[PDB]
Design a binder for this molecule. Structure first.
Ligand SMILES: *[C@@H]1O[C@H](CO)[C@@H](O[C@@H]2O[C@H](CO)[C@@H](O[C@H]3O[C@H](CO[C@H]4O[C@H](CO)[C@@H](O)[C@H](O)[C@@H]4O)[C@@H](O)[C@H](O[C@H]4O[C@H](CO)[C@@H](O)[C@H](O)[C@@H]4O)[C@@H]3O)[C@H](O)[C@H]2NC(C)=O)[C@H](O)[C@H]1NC(C)=O
Lengths: 49, 48
């Protein structure tokens, strides 16, 4: 449902030059460690939670 | 018979669906896009 909650933020690359990469949390609460590892692999430093 | 939004925390188990699951349909669309080898795509959606 969160993609419903962020419709304007999703559509905002049409308005501006912003590039957006969208990732989903796993169903397990403690399984954020591989996903956060991609944060250290893609060098992505501006994260919206 | 129509796809509905499935709440992930729902634990009902007395239903079946016959519309194809949109996870598999989106996987097929992604495979078609990778086969045609695009770089800049546009997704136009009607309902949220
Ligand atoms: C009943 O429903 C179940 C729940 O959805 C089904 O389980 C799911 O099945 C799908 C495919 O049937 C599984 O698919 C894929 O994941 C693998 C590996 O993911 C690996 O990479 C991820 C990276 O983020 C991790 O998150 C994973 O945990 C694991 O590390 C991919 O390699 C697959 O791609 C394969 O398919 C696509 C098709 O487009 C190709 O492009 C690929 O190159 C490759 O061909 C899938 O994306 C899924 O893991 C699984 N489990 C879930 C969602 O929890 C079940 O299949 C279904 N049916 C039954 C039981 O009959």
């Amino acid at each position: 449902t969160g993609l419903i909650r962020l419709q304007e933020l999703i559509k905002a690359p049409s308005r501006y030059n912003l590039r957006l990469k969208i990732r989903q949390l796993p169903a397990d609460t403690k399984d954020a460690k591989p996903l956060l590892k991609e944060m250290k692999r893609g060098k992505e430093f501006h994260v919206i939670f | 018979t129509r796809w509905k939004h499935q709440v992930s925390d729902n634990k009902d188990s007395f239903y079946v669906s016959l519309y194809p699951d949109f996870s598999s349909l989106s996987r097929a669309i992604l495979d078609l896009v990778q086969f045609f080898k695009w770089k800049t795509v546009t997704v136009v959606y009607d309902d949220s």
